[PDB]
Design a protein around this ligand. Structure first.
Ligand SMILES: [Cl-]
Length: 129
C-alpha cells in the first residue's frame, strides 16, 4: 500500500507517534516520505548487506529478522516481512523501540539529513487527523 500523506499522518497519530519522545507528527511523516515514499512494500538494500523494510525502512541488521542478515539482531522480535503490511502497527511498534534507544530519530539517516531542523509542520498541513 502506498498511503496518502494525510492518511499515513492519521494512522501514525492513532498509533501514538504524535510528539512521541518529543518528535512531532510532521517529523515521522517527513521520515516516511524520504524513506519509502509512503509505500509499505518498499525494500532497500544497504551497502553492509542488510535490508531496510517498510514505510519507515527498518533495518534487518538490528531490528527485524529476514533470514539473511549477518549475526543479525531481531530486537523488535518480528520477521521483517511483517513490516511490509498495509497495517502499520508492527512498523510503528518497532519504530518506538528504535527511537527510545538513545540517538532518537537520528537512527533514520534520511530524517537526520533531510527532515532535522526543517519546517516539518508543512508535512501535516491540511490533514484532517
Ligand atoms: Cl531525542
Amino acid at each position: 500500500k502506498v498511503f496518502g500523506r494525510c492518511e499515513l499522518a492519521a494512522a501514525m497519530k492513532r498509533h501514538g507517534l504524535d510528539n512521541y519522545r518529543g518528535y512531532s507528527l510532521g517529523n515521522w511523516v517527513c521520515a516516511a516520505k524520504f524513506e519509502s515514499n509512503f509505500n509499505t512494500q518498499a525494500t532497500n538494500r544497504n551497502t553492509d548487506g542488510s535490508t531496510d523494510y517498510g514505510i519507515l525502512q527498518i533495518n534487518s541488521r538490528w531490528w527485524c529478522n529476514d533470514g539473511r542478515t549477518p549475526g543479525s539482531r531481531n530486537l523488535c522480535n518480528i520477521p521483517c516481512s511483517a513490516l511490509l503490511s498495509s497495517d502499520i502497527t508492527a512498523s510503528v511498534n518497532c519504530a518506538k523501540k528504535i527511537v527510545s534507544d538513545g540517538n532518537g530519530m537520528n537512527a533514520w539517516v534520511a530524517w537526520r539529513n533531510r527532515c532535522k531542523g526543517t519546517d516539518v509542520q508543512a508535512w501535516i498541513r491540511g490533514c484532517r487527523l
